[PDB]
């Protein structure tokens, strides 16, 4: 009953960084994006998303 209970415990992945604060919940429960390798005229940005309470903002 333990082992079959364990089989949900983490799905298959992760990430979380816990660096950027979220102004909607003070907790730094945030995720970060590495994208825009080249793109156009828009500068490559680091995008940060807060898992809880759904917040997303940019390095810029």
Residues of each annotated binding site for Zn(2+):
22, 25, 50, 53
With CB under 5 to 8 Å by kind, the binding choice for 25 among Zn ion, another protein, none is: Zn ion
Q: Which residue's structure tokens are 């793109």?
A: 39
Which C-beta is closer to another protein: that of 6 or that of 24?
A: 24
Which C-beta is closer to another protein: that of 7 or that of 53?
A: 53
Contact residues: Zn ion, CB under 5 A: 22, 24-25, 50, 52-53, 55
Structure tokens at 18: 């816990």
Residues 31/51, Cβ–Cβ less than 8 Å? yes
Structure tokens at 39: 């793109």
């Amino acid at each position: 009953k333990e082992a079959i209970r364990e089989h949900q415990m983490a799905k298959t992945g992760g990430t979380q960084t816990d660096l950027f604060t979220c102004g909607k919940c003070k907790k730094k429960n945030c995720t970060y994006t590495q994208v825009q390798t080249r793109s156009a005229d828009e500068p490559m940005t680091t995008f940060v998303v807060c898992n809880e309470c759904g917040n997303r903002w940019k390095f810029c």
